[model samples]
Target: VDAKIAKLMGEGYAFEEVKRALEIAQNNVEVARSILREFAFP
Candidate 1:
């Protein structure tokens, strides 16, 4: 999970987005990415 976080962080995703995405997505990277993408435009 930590590595996932780090990877997302290194990828330039915001910290809050990463945390929220991890929670909402239940640590699923793809789902989190979808959430992030949605939130990014909304």
Candidate 2:
């Protein structure tokens, strides 16, 4: 996995979850975080 993906995992995200977030946000971690929040809590 990429370091970014691994970082997200360290912060408690699954591989698929981070992958989708990265895709949705164009590999921007800050934006991916927004997507991740919604995916997990919404």
Candidate 3:
């Protein structure tokens, strides 16, 4: 469905997690990655 979602999933983040990160990041891939990092590490 979403290319960004696929890209993030490729990085090993869960589908639903990536979707929420993308939303919080406003579709900014880099920002989403940062958010995911926080989610993963913190």
Best by TM-score: 3
Q: What root-mean-square deviation over C-alphas does model 1 reach?
A: 1.6
User: Residue 24 of candidate 1: its Cα lDDT?
Assistant: 93
What are the clashing pairs of model 1?
A: none
Candidate 1, residues 1-42, lDDT tens digits: the string is 788788888888988879889899999988888788778644
Every model's TM-score: 0.79, 0.80, 0.86
Q: Please, what is the whole-model Cα lDDT of each candidate in the order they appear?
A: 0.84, 0.83, 0.89
Indicate the TM-score of model 1: 0.79
Q: Residue pairs in steric clash, candidate 2?
A: none
- Poorest 10 consecutive residues of model 1 by lDDT? 33-42
**Which candidate model has the greater lDDT, 1 or 3?**
3
* lDDT, candidate 3, 1-42, per-residue tens: 399999999999998889999999999999999999987643
Clashes of 2: 0
Considering summed lDDT, which 10 consecutive residues are worst modelled in model 2?
Answer: 33-42
After TM-score superposition, the amount by which residue 13's alpha carbon in candidate 3 deviates from its true location, in angstroms, is 0.5
